[PDB]
């Protein structure tokens, strides 16, 4: 299908979110991410692994 399958408007396939803040105890390492899902595109959390 050659129509309405690709945006052709310069958007990434992979995005890396750095944590907005991170705090560590001596048992846990809590990290907070602020991920923003564009304005048109959508994603499923089958992606979004932690690196």
């Amino acid at each position: 299908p050659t129509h309405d399958v690709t945006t052709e408007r310069s958007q990434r396939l992979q995005l890396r979110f750095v944590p907005v803040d991170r705090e560590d105890t001596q048992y846990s390492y809590k990290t907070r991410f602020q991920l923003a899902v564009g304005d048109n595109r959508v994603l499923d959390m089958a992606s979004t692994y932690f690196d």
């Binding site: 299908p1 050659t2 399958v5 690709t6 052709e8 396939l13």
Partner: protein, 51 residues
Amino acid sequence: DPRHALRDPERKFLCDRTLWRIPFSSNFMSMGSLTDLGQNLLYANAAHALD
């Protein structure tokens, strides 16, 4: 042992019967033999040089 040596890691991989594939598609998927943008290079299209 505690008599270990301070050392460094090395990573690599082997692919023994693979052809590295770069599909000619807008989103790298395979939704047809006649790829997405390959059909999009026929709009009374011109000639291109590939490097």
